[PDB]
Amino acid sequence: EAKPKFLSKAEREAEALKRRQQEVEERQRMLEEERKKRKQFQDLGR
């Protein structure tokens, strides 16, 4: 919110690990949906 809270360095890097785990999970999700789009594009010509 408005007042910035202090976050400890262990807590900051835990938040950063949770963040980078989130976006590597959405990168994995987008990659397997990319595989789904690719299979869909592939079998509409086969």
């Binding site: 990319e34 595989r35 789009k37 690719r38 594009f41 592939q42 010509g45």
Partner: protein, 48 residues
């Protein structure tokens, strides 16, 4: 170009056939004519 595009697509799964194109910048007299083409699913299968 469609064989090149479809071989790149068949070897790389990050190339989505809906979104990947071939822009051709043809050298017309004193100018350049640009035309972007997409592969249909018939074209990817044939060029593969």
């Amino acid at each position: 170009d469609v064989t090149t595009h479809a071989k790149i697509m068949a070897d790389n799964p990050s190339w989505d056939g809906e979104k990947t194109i071939i822009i051709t910048c043809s050298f017309t007299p004193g100018s350049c004519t640009l035309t972007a083409y997409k592969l249909t699913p018939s074209g990817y299968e044939w060029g593969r």
